[PDB]
RNA sequence: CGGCCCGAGGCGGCGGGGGCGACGGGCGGAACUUAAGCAUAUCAGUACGCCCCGGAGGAGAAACCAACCGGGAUUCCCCG
RNA sequence: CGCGCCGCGGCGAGCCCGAGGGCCCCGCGGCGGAGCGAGCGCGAGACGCCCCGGGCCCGCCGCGCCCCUGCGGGCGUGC
RNA sequence: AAGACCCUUUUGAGCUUGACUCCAGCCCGGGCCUGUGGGGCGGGGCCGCCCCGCUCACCCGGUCGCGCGGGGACCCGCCCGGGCGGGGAGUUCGGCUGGGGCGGCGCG
């Protein structure tokens, strides 16, 4: 699900730590936000550097 | 460019500065650093000691970031505080509101001891500190922290 | 479960007795018969399927009789010239291994067949047998069947020649990664040059 | 340029001039030879370009 | 030294503990095996030294045949209880 | 006398073979040269000889690196 | 292409058209900033228009004396 | 005709050998290939050797496979080990010096 709408994801990564994990969540979650589904605007670069 | 070069100004010299009697030829010494133990060591001796040899302990694969290592002064304290505060603190030498560095912040791990420091109290937390550093800094009435 | 969990077991200890003697009948045989042969059906189907047979129309298996012990060179009158270093004639050893130049000796027998995998079925003093599996890639069979089609494609002729079979790799060092295999992909020749480059930027 | 013709010099004892010949005699392979390579031939490894801060 | 010295290693930080990580019926196929094939020849010559008491001798044949210390001390072990009587 | 097993001749459809002054893959493999001589070393895992594809090829989703408040298949560029 | 020295330009405890991304714009290392010791490691203010010398400080090798957390700290003497 | 005699160069090559450092080849030993039985000797408290049947591996003959043999678990082959080895390979064969060489050694 998150493959399709847009995410890398790297299944032979593992945490180190809890906050690993916090920083990380709280980048998904601000994305989901962010993102809407289908005049429309492409982001450009990077997306959240 | 060609035209201000010392090797124009020898046209119509026959040999080009290298001598009638000696010449110019390939290589009337040798190639590259031969002979420095035989023909050559009046200048290994006089300008190269400890050249040949061996020396010391060798390591088959050196980390570089285990053995990286840098290091701060005390009299470099006071300037990694910004300009515009530098002056507040200073008048309001306080006990209760100390300025506090973190050397690790701004990338260094050892805290040396050369030169001075103002008298104002601070707090300065590096990962290891040497004698005479903290000797001068609780001398000024500051104190030496350890951070992870 | 099923029965090549016990044949892969009973094949794991050939010193048995039972074993000893079905081993003599084989090279027997073999001995008696050519150097390269066509085989009805494969004599280790659990091995075969291990390394990708199937059952189906398009498959083959071929064995292959090579020779044992290490390499001469030919100089005529066992003379080398030149510097002292290079001056030995026998008591050498090849740079690939058995398997694998079985598995190039098939190939060059028959060049319209594609070379998939081998594995071991005898030897004595003098001969090593292997077999290799090969596959028709005209065959409707094979063409149409989404698992096996890849090797249709035209970048697999003579995989052998080019030494991408899992001999052929073992020989160029593949079956290794991290430290001590730095310099091997992606192949020797390649990094050589890639270290030895000399690259002049023109804001150098 | 220069270089793809087969030369070489054929000796003292010819009373001729000591530099590579084709076959048949005819001067090669010199800069002050009639169809030979330049005594140092240009190459594009030149720097063509200049920094500037 | 392999770490870099800093006291409070692990100050900041809450580090993960993960969960470190048989088949009798595998059992059960190798004593199938067993019944319908035996032993091989160096395994018979180490029970009857160990039969003979030579525990030094066998742990030398073992690491001759297999060519490394724990596989030939695993191998012995597994052998004396066939070896007892 | 039939079955299964291992072979033999013929017939039909389909495929292979040769060709290239580059790039690419697999093998075999020098000597001149340098060491101010010369054997190890160097030149060079180069010249050259043989085999094999393609439009690229090879490599590739850890029996990896690490020692960190850790990264995460392959290729290529900068850096030492 | 690499090494040494000299001259000139820009900026200066800093400096810098890597590669790359949008004759213009943005752009990491790196080098310099601290040395000495085979290494465990420890770690520089006191003077001076400039130069030369003297003195003193840091490391390596040795040795008095005092002590706290101790084959660890402090304070000294010597080539 | 850039002396061919003579000398120098840290320039060669043909030939030799008791120069230096090696290579083919050949001889010798164990092991694998490699079966199935019977015996003797000695040691240490199972181990090491040695011998001799059989045929089925492996090897050699005869024959148009037209009415037949000989060897044999040894030989070969392969792996490792030791010896012989100018047949062959590569290379070296100081310096000073009233020219060089024989001689001498103001070569430390
Ligand atoms: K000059
Ligand atoms: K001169
Ligand atoms: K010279
Ligand atoms: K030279
Ligand atoms: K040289
Ligand atoms: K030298
Ligand atoms: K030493
Ligand atoms: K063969
Ligand atoms: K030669
Ligand atoms: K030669
Ligand atoms: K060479
Ligand atoms: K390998
Ligand atoms: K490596
Ligand atoms: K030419
Ligand atoms: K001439
Ligand atoms: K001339
Ligand atoms: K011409
Ligand atoms: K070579
Ligand atoms: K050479
Ligand atoms: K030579
Ligand atoms: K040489
Ligand atoms: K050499
Ligand atoms: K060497
Ligand atoms: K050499
Ligand atoms: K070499
Ligand atoms: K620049
Ligand atoms: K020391
Ligand atoms: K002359
Ligand atoms: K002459
Ligand atoms: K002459
Ligand atoms: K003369
Ligand atoms: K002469
Ligand atoms: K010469
Ligand atoms: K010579
Ligand atoms: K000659
Ligand atoms: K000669
Ligand atoms: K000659
Ligand atoms: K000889
Ligand atoms: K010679
Ligand atoms: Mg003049
Ligand atoms: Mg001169
Ligand atoms: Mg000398
Ligand atoms: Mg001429
Ligand atoms: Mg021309
Ligand atoms: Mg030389
Ligand atoms: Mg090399
Ligand atoms: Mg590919
Ligand atoms: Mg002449
Ligand atoms: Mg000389
Ligand atoms: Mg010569
Ligand atoms: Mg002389």
Known sequence: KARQIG???????????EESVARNVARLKEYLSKVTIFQAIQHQGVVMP | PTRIRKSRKRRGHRQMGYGRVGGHRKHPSGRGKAGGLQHKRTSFDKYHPGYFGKLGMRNYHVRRNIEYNPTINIDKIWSLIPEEQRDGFLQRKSTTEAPVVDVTRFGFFKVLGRGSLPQCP??????????????????????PLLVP | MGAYKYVQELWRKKQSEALHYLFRLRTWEYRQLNAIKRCSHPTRPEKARRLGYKAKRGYVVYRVRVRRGGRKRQCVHGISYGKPRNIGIVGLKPSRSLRALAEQKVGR??????????????????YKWYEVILIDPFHPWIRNDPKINWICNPVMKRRECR???????????????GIGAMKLRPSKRAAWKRNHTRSLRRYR | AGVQCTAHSWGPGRAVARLPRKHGGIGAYANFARGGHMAHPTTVIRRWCRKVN | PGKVFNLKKGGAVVRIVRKKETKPHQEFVKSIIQECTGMAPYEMHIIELLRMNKDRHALRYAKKRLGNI???????????????N
């Open chain 1, 7 to 17: 995410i890398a994801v790297d299944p032979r990564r593992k945490n180190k730590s």
């Open chain 2, 122 to 143: 601070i707090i300065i937390k590096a990962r290891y500190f040497s004698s005479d550093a903290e000797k001068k800094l609780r001398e000024v009435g500051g104190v």
């Open chain 3, 109 to 126: 027998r028959l060049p319209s067949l594609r070379v998939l995998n081998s594995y071991w079925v005898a030897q004595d003093g003098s």
């Open chain 3, 163 to 177: 030494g991408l079979t899992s001999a052929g790799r073992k020989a160029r060092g593949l079956h290794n990664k």
């Open chain 5, 70 to 84: 724990k596989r030939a001390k695993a191998k012995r072990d597994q052998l004396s209880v066939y070896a007892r």
